[PDB]
Write a protein that binds this ligand. Structure first.
Ligand SMILES: *C(=O)[C@](NC(=O)[C@H](C(=O)O)c1ccsc1)(OC)[C@@H]1N[C@@H](C(=O)O)C(C)(C)S1
Ligand SMILES: *C(=O)[C@](NC(=O)[C@H](C(=O)O)c1ccsc1)(OC)[C@@H]1N[C@@H](C(=O)O)C(C)(C)S1
Lengths: 260, 263
C-alpha cells in the first residue's frame, strides 16, 4: 500500500521525495529513498540548537551568554536578529529564534558558538549520527545542488537522530524537554507535515526550503492515545528556480497516517 | 466601483465553491480594499484575539492580573485542549491561558478568558468599548464554531475586524506594554503558515490568528510588516454551503497573494 502511494506522489510531484517514519509504538519504519542524501536547508538548525543544548549540560550558564549582533552579521532572513542589531541576544534567544522563526543570523551564531559547521557535524558524530554533515554557514548551506554532498543527510539518519534528541537520551532530561518545547512552538510548520495529520495530533517540527525547490520538514508527532512518531519528509526538484511544494510533504504525511 | 483587485478576488471566489470576505488596511496611506467587507462571517477561533485583548485591557489597571492562577478541572476540557490538558487538576495563569488561546488555539484556554470577562457578552462589551459596533460573541467554545449560514451568533464583518485588529496591534486601543504583548503573541502563532502567510513574500513578517469550524469555515486575521513599507492589516474569511465541507486554507493564501500583488 504505502510504497505504491509514495511512489505515485513522487511521480505526480516531478521531484525527488525522501521519507523516513519511525513509529515508536513498535519500532516499525516506512522508508522511501531513506538512504539517499538530500539538502537539509533549515532542518539543519535542529542539530545546531541541540549541539548548543548539549554544551549547556556542562557550561551551566551558557544559554544566558550574551552574543553581539552587528549590522554586518545580518544575512538573508533575520526576522528576530534585525530587532537586536547593535545589541545582544542570549544563546537561548538565538536557539529559539533559529528553531521557531528560522532566523538565519541566529543559526550563524549557533554555528559560530560550536566553532564552525564542523562543530555541528562533531556533535552529530558524538550522538552516533555518521551520516549528517554541515559544511557551510547561512545562507550558502541552502544551494541544494544535485549530487553535492555538502549540508546533506539521509531521511533514515535524520529520523533516527531526531528520535534520539527528542524521545531518547542524546540530551540531558532538561535539554531534551527544552528542544521539544521549542519544536512544539514552531511558527513555520502548518502547511507541511502537520497539514497531512489529524488536527487532534500534537506536532513539533522544523521546516526548510532552498534552491531547486527544496521543501523539507522533520517532525515529532504525538497522536491521540498512542506512542509518538518521528517523520522526515525531504523533497527537491530538477530546476534551480523551482517553486516550494509544502503540499507534497503534507500529502506524504497523510499517506503515512492512513497506513497505520 | 470594482477595482482590479476586487475582480481577481471575485474570480478566486467563483472557483472556490464558497463565500470569501476580505478587508485590507494599508497603514502607508490608511486606504482599505474590501471584498464582501460588510457581510457577516462566523469568526471561529479568530474571536480569541478579542478575548485575549479584553484581558490585556483588564491588566492595565491590575499589574499582577496576567500572573493570576485559574483552576483547570477535568470537566473544563472541551474539544481541542493541547495546552490545558497538561494542567488539569492544577492552574494556569491568565498569561499562560492567553498564550495558549492565541498561539495554539486552545479552546479550554479561550473559555477561561471568556469567563474572566464575565461570559461571551463581556467580550462583545470590550469590542464596543474600542469602537467595534459589529463584533458579537454569543457562545463559549466549542459551540461558537457552528458557523451556520445566516446565523448572526459569533460573527463579524471583514471591515470591522480589520479596523479592530489595527487599533489593537498598531493603534492605541491598548496600553503600549499590552499592545507589544499582543503583537509578540500573534507573531509566535503556530497555526498560520498555510493561510495568509502562504500568499505573501517570505521576507514579510506576519502575526496572525487562524480559525476553522463547520461549513468548511476557514479564517485568518493578520498584521503584516512588508519589507520596506508600513504595516498592513488583512482579514480573510471563507465559508461554504455544506456543514461537512473541507477547510480551504489555500483560498486564504490565494486572497493574500492577490492583495500583495495589488499593492
Ligand atoms: C531554512 O530553510 C530557511 N530558508 C532558507 O534557508 C533559504 C535560504 O536560502 O536562506 C530561503 C528560502 C526562501 S527565503 C530563504 O532559513 C531562513 C527558512 N525556512 C523556510 C521554510 O521553512 O520554507 C522559510 C520559512 C521560507 S525561511
Ligand atoms: C478555532 O477555530 C479552533 N478550531 C475550532 O474552533 C473548531 C471547533 O469546532 O472547536 C475546530 C475545527 C477543527 S478541530 C476544532 O479552535 C480550537 C482552532 N483553529 C483551527 C484552525 O486554525 O484551522 C484549528 C487549528 C484546526 S483548531
Amino acid at each position: 500500500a504505502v510504497q505504491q502511494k509514495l511512489a505515485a506522489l513522487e511521480k505526480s510531484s516531478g521531484g525527488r521525495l525522501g521519507v523516513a517514519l519511525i513509529d515508536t509504538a513498535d519500532n516499525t519504519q516506512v522508508l522511501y529513498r531513506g538512504d539517499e542524501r538530500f539538502p537539509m536547508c533549515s532542518t539543519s538548525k535542529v542539530m545546531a540548537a541541540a549541539a548548543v543544548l548539549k554544551q549547556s549540560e556542562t557550561q551551566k550558564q551558557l544559554l544566558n551568554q550574551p552574543v553581539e549582533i552587528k549590522p554586518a552579521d545580518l544575512v538573508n532572513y533575520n526576522p528576530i536578529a534585525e530587532k537586536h542589531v547593535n545589541g545582544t541576544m542570549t544563546l537561548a534567544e538565538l536557539s529559539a529564534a533559529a528553531l521557531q522563526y528560522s532566523d538565519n543570523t541566529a543559526m550563524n551564531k549557533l554555528i559560530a558558538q560550536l566553532g564552525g559547521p564542523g562543530g555541528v557535524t562533531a556533535f552529530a558524530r558524538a550522538i552516533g549520527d555518521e551520516t549528517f554533515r554541515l559544511d557551510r554557514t547561512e545562507p550558502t548551506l541552502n544551494t541544494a545542488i544535485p549530487g553535492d554532498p555538502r549540508d546533506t543527510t539521509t531521511p533514515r539518519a535524520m529520523a533516527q537522530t531526531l528520535r534520539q534528541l527528542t524521545l531518547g537520551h542524546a540530551l540531558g532530561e532538561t535539554q531534551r524537554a527544552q528542544l521539544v518545547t521549542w519544536l512544539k512552538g514552531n511558527t513555520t510548520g502548518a502547511a507541511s507535515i502537520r497539514a497531512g495529520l489529524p488536527t487532534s495530533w500534537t506536532v513539533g517540527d522544523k521546516t526548510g526550503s532552498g534552491d531547486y525547490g527544496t521543501t523539507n520538514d522533520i517532525a515529532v508527532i504525538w497522536p491521540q492515545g498512542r506512542a509518538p512518531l518521528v517523520l522526515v519528509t525531504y523533497f527537491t526538484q530538477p530546476q534551480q528556480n523551482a517553486e516550494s511544494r509544502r503540499d507534497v510533504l503534507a500529502s506524504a504525511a497523510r499517506i503515512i497516517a492512513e497506513g497505520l
